From a paper:
[name] directly binds to microtubules and maintains load-bearing attachments to both growing and shortening microtubule tips in vitro. [name] has the following predicted regions conserved among kinetoplastid species: an N-terminal α helix, a coiled-coil region and a block of basic residues in the microtubule-binding domain, and a BRCT domain at the C terminus.
Although we still failed to obtain diffraction-quality crystals from T. brucei, a crystal structure of KKT4117–218 from [name] was solved at 1.9 Å resolution. TcKKT4117–218 is homologous to KKT4120–224 in T. brucei. The coiled coil consists of eight regular heptad repeats starting at Y121 and ending at K176. If the first and eighth heptad are included, the pitch increases to 163 ± 60 Å, indicating less supercoiling in these terminal heptads. Superposition of the coiled coils from [name] and L. mexicana revealed a good structural match with a root-mean-square deviation (RMSD) of 1.03 Å (for 123 Cα), confirming the conservation of the coiled-coil structure in these species. Instead, we observed elevated B factors for the region where we might expect to find an unstructured linker in the TcKKT4 structure based on the sequence alignment. A homology model for the two coiled-coil regions of T. brucei KKT4115–232 was built using the [name] coiled-coil X-ray structure, and the sequence alignments confirmed using the RDC data.
Residue numbers in the entry:
A (entry chain B): 116 to 215
B (entry chain A): 116 to 218
């Protein structure tokens, strides 16, 4: 009776002490895992941020190559039309000097 | 004394029980945060692979755009050479006919 009731409560106290020890080891294991994952997430968010800046940089660079090319084309076209006009001018002076 | 001995052990059992519940709650919060981190980890990893693929796609588009620009420049030079040759040949015909006329 009385001794048995007391030893049953002693045994429950020990069961709580051993479960507490187990949960302490598991909480320690979990904290190792959270810290490991937080080091990964922060490292991931950084490279994502660098890659977004990279994509926007390549997109800007493509608009720049197109802008330079369209200008190069316009300069070439202007220079060629003036060269053709120069030939026509020279031809007219030649005809004027030969035919008087 | 028998009663007092049991009641003192009862209070310790409450302290341990309450301490186990606090540790149970802490483990419950921790393992939930792990699961959220594992989800965010795969979500971020998926975006890294996307952005890397987007980078390689833009680099190929850039090289082909440069290649296309170089072809268009060569075709412009070709057409200009065509027109120069046509102008100079028309001026030579005009010369030949006008020198014939004044003969
Ligand atoms: C829980 C405890 O108080 C009880 N005496 C038992 O035997 O489990």
């Amino acid at each position: 009776s009385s001794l048995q009731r007391y030893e049953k409560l002693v045994k429950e106290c020990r069961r709580l002490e051993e479960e507490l020890e187990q949960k302490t080891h598991e909480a320690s294991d979990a904290s190792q895992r959270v810290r490991q994952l937080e080091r990964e997430t922060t490292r991931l968010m950084r490279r994502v941020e660098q890659l977004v800046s990279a994509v926007e940089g390549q997109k800007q660079k493509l608009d720049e190559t197109e802008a330079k090319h369209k200008l190069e084309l316009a300069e070439i076209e202007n220079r060629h039309e003036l060269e053709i006009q120069s030939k026509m001018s020279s031809h007219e002076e030649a005809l004027r000097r030969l035919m008087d």
